[PDB]
């Protein structure tokens, strides 16, 4: 991993030692080249996972998440340029450094071999995330959004820290490979049931689980666009990735311990998807859509089947690209009229025909049109849950209906109908903006062509 | 024939001869507890370094 991490660290001096007129062109270009180098992790010609050293590894679960992380950094930079163009030069460089910091921290997080190392990097990400939300968010509610985000995470993370220390005191190590091979059955004591919850809650809050999700709609509505991109695409996946790594040592208590969280997720995914039908704020709508999708990820990880893990891995990647695309699409209208109210701008297909095409594909991805990886992940999750209990299809069926309703509702409301023609400041789409949309959507199509790369650990 | 001792003479420490044996354990003390065994050998580096969580060295 050092041949990926070291060049990423060199982006920081590159940012600060570049001329003001070359900073964006420089950092974006090398960020693309670093994404290219991360593809080396996909050269996997056997079934032994790559252990580069005692500290860094990569297997079929972390490899897609590392590459998606590397790809997001250039995309976030392009997304940020227009709304930062009034900041002075030092403030622009500070913002870029925050974005690089997350890229470095997240790549290290997904390749860490030891759980307290994962925990430290997992917690470190809050610092640049909070700074981005609160220093560059637009509204007065960005400060409250920062508090919710930081402290929903932290209250769950403290029990996680206790559990990790406890496991290490008992086993002698937090190395993941050794924990895997030497794992032994747990007794079903009250003490072990609290251990299960301490190991799971921080990851479940991060997903977020329905019930403790209020931080996420707040954080998205208030964050700048690059903050929304990283939060929806990668940061939520830390919880799902954490749950998959740590659940190997929690057997057999997950068989009964999972029931309340399957119930919250399967019912909760209907509550949050139905909220999207009556949401007046476009960013909030996309955010609630994420909570509904991540509810599926929670359910499939909880039932721990080969299909359920594979469907969760695909959905994690597919949602990452799709939701980041939707935030970028919404931000392009906001940068023109400076409102997130969905019903304000209307008939936009009349004036932005190619941007409306990007809107349609993002919406078709979101409602899981086959053969997209969006549908493939949701399909295999549905099959595994049906096996777990045939009555799950009732709640799946309701969510599928509602997801089509709000996905097409967003398109009809904003792109169709009569143009709101008092909006004479609807400047034509930027080349940068149209390029940004394509950089989301080409990988989604390419991954649909070769879905072996995101199947995860079980297939 | 008694000569009075001079100033300083009576305060001297003197040696006296006695057939009485020297007491061997006048305090009636017990045997002292044995010291802790000492660990010997040369120093080697700590095996695998500090071993502090995930630090390699
Ligand atoms: C629809 C029209 C087709 C357009 C794509 C055609 C390009 C092509 O030739 O791809 C074919 C190839 C299929 O190969 P294969 O998976 O082995 O097929 C199954 C067995 N025959 O598919 C491939 O091997 C190409 C797979 C795409 C590789 C991605 C390239 C870089 C992606 C940039 C990073 C962004 C993605 C971030 C998340 C990635 C997670 C790993």
CA A211/CA A264 separation, integer angstroms: 8
Could you tell me which residues come within 8 angstroms of residue A33 by beta carbon, excluding any fewer than 6 positions away? A7
Q: Helices A392-415 & A373-388, crossing angle to 10 degrees? A: 150
Resolution in A: 2.4
Helix residue ranges, H only, A20-114:
23-38, 62-84, 89-111
**Helix (H) / strand (E) containing A323:** helix A306-337
Compute the distance between CA of residue A207 and CA of residue A201 in angstroms, rounded to an integer.
10
Q: Tell whether ligand 1 has an atom less than 6 A from the beta carbon of residue A36.
A: no
- A446 C-alpha to center of ligand 1: Å? 4
What tokens does B49 get?
């370094």
DSSP A112: B
Structural element, H or E, at residue A440: helix A431-449
Give Cβ neighbours of residue A121 (< 8 Å, ≥ 6 apart).
A105, A106, A108, A109, A112
Domain coordinates in residue numbering, chain A: 2-459
- Cβ proximity of A266 and A392 under 8 Å: yes
CA pseudo-torsion sign A262, A267, A207, A371: positive
DSSP symbol at A50: E
Contacts of A419 (CB under 8 A, 6+ apart): A346, A347, A348, A350, A351
Report CA dihedral (A418, A423, A427, A428) to the nearest 10 degrees.
0
What is the whole-number distance in angstroms between the Cα of residue A43 and the centre of ligand 1? 13
Cross-strand pairs, A51:
A57
**Residue carrying structure tokens 């206790």:** A162
Q: From CA A173, how far away is CA A208, in angstroms rounded?
A: 29
Tokens 């939520």 locate to A236
Tokens 């969006």, residue? A374
Q: What's the length of chain A?
A: 459
Determine which of B50, B53, B56 to mutate to test the interface with A (most A C-beta atoms within 10 Å): B53
Q: Do B54 and A113 touch (CB under 8 A)?
A: yes
Q: Decide: A399 and A269 in contact? Cβ < 8 Å.
A: yes
Residues of chain A positioned with their CB less than 8 A from the CB of B54: 54-55, 112-114, 116-117, 174
CA A57 to chain centre: 21
Residue for token pair 């062509």: A449
Does any ligand 1 atom lie closer than 6 A to the CB of residue A454?
A: yes
> Measured between alpha carbons, how far is A343 from A432 in angstroms, rounded to an integer?
26
């Amino acid at each position: 991993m050092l041949k990926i991490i070291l060049p990423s660290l060199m982006l920081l001096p590159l940012t600060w030692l570049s001329s003001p007129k070359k900073t964006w062109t420089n950092v974006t270009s090398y960020s693309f080249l670093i994404s290219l180098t991360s593809l080396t992790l996909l050269w996997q010609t056997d079934e032994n996972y790559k252990n580069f050293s005692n500290m860094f590894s990569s297997d079929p679960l972390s490899t897609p998440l590392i590459i998606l992380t590397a790809w997001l950094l250039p995309l976030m930079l392009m997304a940020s340029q227009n709304h930062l163009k009034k900041d002075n030069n030092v403030l622009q460089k500070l913002y870029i450094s925050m974005l690089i910091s997350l890229q470095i921290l997240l790549i290290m997080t997904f390749s860490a071999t030891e759980l307290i190392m994962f925990y430290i990097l997992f917690e470190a990400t809050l610092i640049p995330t909070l700074i981005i939300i609160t220093r560059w968010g637009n509204q007065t509610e960005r400060l409250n959004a920062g508090i919710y985000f930081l402290f929903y995470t932290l209250i769950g993370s403290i029990p996680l820290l206790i559990a990790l220390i406890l496991i290490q005191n008992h086993v002698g190590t937090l190395n993941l490979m050794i924990l895997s091979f030497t794992t032994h059955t747990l007794d079903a004591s009250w003490s072990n049931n609290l251990l299960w919850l301490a190991c799971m809650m921080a990851f479940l809050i991060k997903m977020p689980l329905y019930g403790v999700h209020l931080w996420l709609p707040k954080a998205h509505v208030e964050a700048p666009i690059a903050g929304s991109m990283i939060l929806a695409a990668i940061l939520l996946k830390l919880g799902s990735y954490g749950m998959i790594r740590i659940s190997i040592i929690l057997d057999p208590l997950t068989k009964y311990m999972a029931y309340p969280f399957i119930l919250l997720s399967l019912w909760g995914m209907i509550m949050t998807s139905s909220i999207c039908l009556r949401q007046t704020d476009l960013k909030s709508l996309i955010a609630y859509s994420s909570v509904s999708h991540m509810a599926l990820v929670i359910a499939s990880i909880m039932i721990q089947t080969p299909w359920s893990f594979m469907g969760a891995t695909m959905l994690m990647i597919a949602h990452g690209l799709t939701s980041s695309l939707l935030f970028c699409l919404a931000n392009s209208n906001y940068e023109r009229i400076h409102s997130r109210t969905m019903i304000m701008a209307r008939g936009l297909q009349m004036v932005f025909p190619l941007m409306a095409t990007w809107w349609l594909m993002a919406s078709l991805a979101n409602l899981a049109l086959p053969p997209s990886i969006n549908l493939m992940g949701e399909l295999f999750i549905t099959m595994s849950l049906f096996s777990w209990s045939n009555f799950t299809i009732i709640l799946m069926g309701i969510n599928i209906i509602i997801t089509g309703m709000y996905s097409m509702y967003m398109i009809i409301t904003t792109q169709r109908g009569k143009l709101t023609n008092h909006m004479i400041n609807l400047q034509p789409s930027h080349t940068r903006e149209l390029t940004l949309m394509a950089l989301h959507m080409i990988p989604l199509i390419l991954l649909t062509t070769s879905p072996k790369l995101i199947t995860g650990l079980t297939m | 024939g008694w000569v009075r001792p001079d100033l300083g003479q009576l305060s001297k420490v003197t040696k006296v001869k006695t057939d009485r044996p020297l007491p061997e354990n006048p305090y009636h003390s017990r045997a002292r507890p044995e010291p802790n065994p000492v660990i010997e050998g040369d120093l080697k580096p700590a095996k695998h370094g500090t071993r502090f969580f995930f630090w390699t060295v």
